[PDB]
Design a protein around this ligand. Sequence first.
Ligand code: HEC
Ligand code: HEC
Ligand code: HEC
Ligand code: HEM
Ligand code: HEM
Ligand SMILES: [Ca+2]
Ligand SMILES: [Ca+2]
Ligand SMILES: [Cu+2]
Lengths: 29, 466, 197, 303
Amino acid sequence: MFVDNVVLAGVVTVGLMVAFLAGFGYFIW
Amino acid sequence: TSTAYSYKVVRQFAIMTVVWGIVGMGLGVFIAAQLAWPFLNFDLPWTSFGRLRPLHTNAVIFAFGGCALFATSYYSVQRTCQTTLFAPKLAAFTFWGWQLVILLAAISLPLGFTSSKEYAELEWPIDILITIVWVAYAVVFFGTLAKRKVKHIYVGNWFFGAFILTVAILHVVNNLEIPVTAMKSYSLYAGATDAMVQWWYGHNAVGFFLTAGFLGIMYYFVPKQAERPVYSYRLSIVHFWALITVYIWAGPHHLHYTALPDWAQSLGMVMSLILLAPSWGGMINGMMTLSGAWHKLRSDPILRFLVVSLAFYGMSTFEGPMMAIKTVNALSHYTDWTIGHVHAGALGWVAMVSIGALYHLVPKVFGREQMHSIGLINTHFWLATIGTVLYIASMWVNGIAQGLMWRAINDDGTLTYSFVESLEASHPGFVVRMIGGAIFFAGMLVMAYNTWRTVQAAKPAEYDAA
Amino acid sequence: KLEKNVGLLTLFMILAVSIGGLTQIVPLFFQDSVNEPVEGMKPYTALQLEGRDLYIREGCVGCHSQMIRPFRAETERYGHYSVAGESVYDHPFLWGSKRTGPDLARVGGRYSDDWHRAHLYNPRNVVPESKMPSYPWLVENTLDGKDTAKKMSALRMLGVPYTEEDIAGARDSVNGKTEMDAMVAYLQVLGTALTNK
Amino acid sequence: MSTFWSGYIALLTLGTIVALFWLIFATRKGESAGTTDQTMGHAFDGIEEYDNPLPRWWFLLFIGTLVFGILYLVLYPGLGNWKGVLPGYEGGWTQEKQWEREVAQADEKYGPIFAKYAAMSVEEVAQDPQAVKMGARLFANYCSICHGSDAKGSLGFPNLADQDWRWGGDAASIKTSILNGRIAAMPAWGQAIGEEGVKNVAAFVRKDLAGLPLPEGTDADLSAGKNVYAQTCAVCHGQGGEGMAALGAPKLNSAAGWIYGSSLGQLQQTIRHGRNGQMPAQQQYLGDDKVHLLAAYVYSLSQ
Ligand code: HEC
Ligand code: HEC
Ligand code: HEC
Ligand code: HEM
Ligand code: HEM
Ligand SMILES: [Ca+2]
Ligand SMILES: [Ca+2]
Ligand SMILES: [Cu+2]
């Protein structure tokens, strides 16, 4: 895929959301 | 006498909350399908996407979310300060009034009468009606507060009260418009100024209508369902005032890298980032309340709803600040990612919490000890969760794909993708989202059936007295 | 405490909630850069104005942005990044918030009237993989120009410098034209103001 | 922005931040610093509230955000007219300024490639594969929507891939088409020629010129058609329908290059009401460089 600063910002933002959700989600079990 | 809570209006607004939930989310599924398969536009002006979209929007926010807010606030305030609703008939007026508003939306928007201003699309006569109904609502609520029993006012009503006042201000300011004809007006503002008024209004719409008001909901029902005390009253103070003040500033995060001046844009980003803290103070206060009683989650699906609701709330009040960063918005803006965020908050926070709240209150208000089937509350929970997650996922995929493809440059500087290539890339996403939303909608039907079954049971249902 | 005081809580709420509005909206009323038209620019012509209101009624904004962001790739794709002065007479503004379809801030003269007609009549017919709705009724409907005068009067009242010449016979500028005529007329002026000043 | 407004904005923004700090701390004073579990004595319904401390981490987060906000404001425009102190942008930072850099940087990076191609003849550029691929990339973004993603067109819009050219298929002609645009003008013959006249030339062009068969039992006067064509049509399309590239009049001795259909009826409509195809000029939107590469690409297509 095409990689830019902005694309990276977006990707790590979404990743962070996955992390927050995953953490919270398993945290609820 | 009259020292029996007025449950009538709450009853009406509850039922109608489920009804408009169905109608609105149905519309959602439908226009999603239109985005997947354009033939569903049917070459008819009143059923084309452009017109139906704001119908979905208004039905789902002001009709569904709205009625949820009415039922919840009227129940909650009455019990939380222990008196019958002030001016109960005026509350009845706010019911039929609000219904008239929604019906006017349903007729007018497919007919083509729209301001084109997001979440403010209804034309001026309807804006007048709304203002009137809202003033009445304010009188009923703040009046009920003014004639409470306890010295203190519960923080749930700080949020409700705030929501009411600021929504009134918002609505009046952003809908200042010269009427040209019966159903056509021009905005007072234009260009960048209009954009700013619009998104001050627009964001503070979800900020107070869909955040504050529903934080009120959370603050009554989470502790009431869990039967635990509210964690950290100090937090309630901090997070309330800080949210109530910082959120207003968050307007410009919509207009990043637009014709809006740089200074405003920045003010919006900075304050959107500050906003992270109070917002989370909400979900912290909600969840830490459940500490110790987590074993209830496998037991009680209503509580499941409320908690998971807080999960999505935090997630989107984290996602939001992130996307409010100019460099991130640089990719996110105009993409399906925005919509993804939207429905993360919408399905996951607003919808879930109002669902839970209704599942709690509807039996009570209908003189009944509980819902007809708790099992269907659980199956509803799973349908709604799966649906929300699918929706979110498909929109992240689509959004990243779009932003990326749109700005994708080759080694020789030329643009990598045609807009149509991005469009085509998005179709699987459109279909998955259509299915996720469909599933959530199915859950809503399950709720409708359940609620109906319990509604059947008693004609005289004035139980509860205190 | 002020927890027990209804009017004090109410007051400090209305106070706390106002600061952002006062600090963001108010100074824009007086900022020049966002109130100055592009120098060349005129108000929308009766037909253009009518077509813009058609664009509004059909929900075009819902898939189409009119706001080019100052990035190289958006510049390359659409043209010169949008300027505040371009939307100075837009009651109400039609910057997008979504791009289901491409940005239209400068559809300008990028396409022929004929193309716009075919494509609005059936987008799939010219762009097979379009997700855009067909808008054939635009052809079957005729503008009578009844309210154009009123509309322009209202917009002048709101600041838009319509001439008496403009308002007078704004009707016969429009009467008999089809809605499709008006929509096309509107689309063909978008973003033109800047690139020929 | 007038200074008064700049000051007003800054003062209010800062006052709000200060107020926020004051709020977080003032809320914080009797901090247990522990979960504690005490409760306060007033009941709302069912609900009661613990007097708990703010989570230290949440506190930290909140403060950090405000600090970041002050830092951002100092770095970047926002308060008033204050210009950014951020390093590397002289006279501060604005979105426009940022844009100028990205373009300028791009121009420095890619400028030679464009430059290299510009010296070369359009015919020379087509030879270079690298150039063609670049041109194709350009084509999809700006030219695909009308001429098809395959450049093979549709009804109303020329197939650029084939060997049939309306305005000529030499490099110079193609480049001119793209650069300056093109408007064709088939005048309408309906009134001038009569309905029967229309039917007749249509039939003549389809059968006798284009070598297409006529629909069963359509008694058109092909002789009449022929005469009409010679009288009127031959002037622009040539007699025998070679067509004239000068006028963008297409050849009529083959339906292959026709953009308005080849059925008797469609021919009749073309003849009766005329045609005014428009190829928009790209000189303004794309500029000489891009246009040059595109001419190269389109030229390349047909070989
Ligand atoms: C969302 C459901 C759509 C609505 C409503 C409208 N448009 Fe659209 N449009 C859409 C897509 C997916 C595309 C790209 C594919 C295509 O058909 O070209 C478009 C494109 C346009 C264009 C061409 C823009 C360009 O290529 O530069 C124009 C001029 C345009 N659309 C006009 C338009 C108007 C006037 C409509 C409102 C009634 C409108 N569109 C609605 C999808 C959607
Ligand atoms: C649609 C809105 C147009 C866009 C964008 C482009 N072209 Fe086109 N082109 C179009 C039409 C309707 C015609 C026929 C004109 C006529 O005589 O009726 C054309 C023609 C050309 C030609 C000449 C073809 C010939 O036979 O001589 C060329 C070289 C040309 N077009 C190429 C081209 C490129 C490179 C452009 C993209 C930016 C492009 N066209 C866009 C329709 C339109
Ligand atoms: C003078 C120059 C005129 C005259 C007198 C005629 N035509 Fe022809 N024509 C002309 C142009 C510039 C074009 C291109 C139109 C466009 O591309 O928009 C045409 C085209 C046609 C076509 C369509 C070919 C296609 O489908 O692509 C037909 C069928 C046609 N012309 C035939 C025709 C006949 C029968 C007329 C004589 C009375 C005739 N033309 C005259 C230019 C001109
Ligand atoms: C701190 C809290 C929040 C912040 C800072 C925030 C920020 C944002 C941002 C940056 C966007 C993208 C705007 C754009 O690029 O066009 C957005 C869109 C949106 N968000 Fe949030 N968000 C928050 C919470 C929420 C929540 C909880 C909801 C729940 C419904 C919500 C609903 C929406 C809606 C409806 C839009 C779309 C507005 C439009 O149509 O353009 N937001 N928000
Ligand atoms: C339950 C299934 C739902 C489905 C399938 C659905 C579908 C959709 C679709 C397809 C769009 C337009 C997307 C686009 O233009 O790209 C949309 C917009 C929107 N929906 Fe829903 N929706 C659902 C429920 C809800 C709910 C419960 C809310 C509650 C607030 C909501 C709020 C919104 C908002 C605010 C927008 C506008 C977003 C924007 O302007 O950026 N939706 N929805
Ligand atoms: Ca309105
Ligand atoms: Ca939007
Ligand atoms: Cu916002």
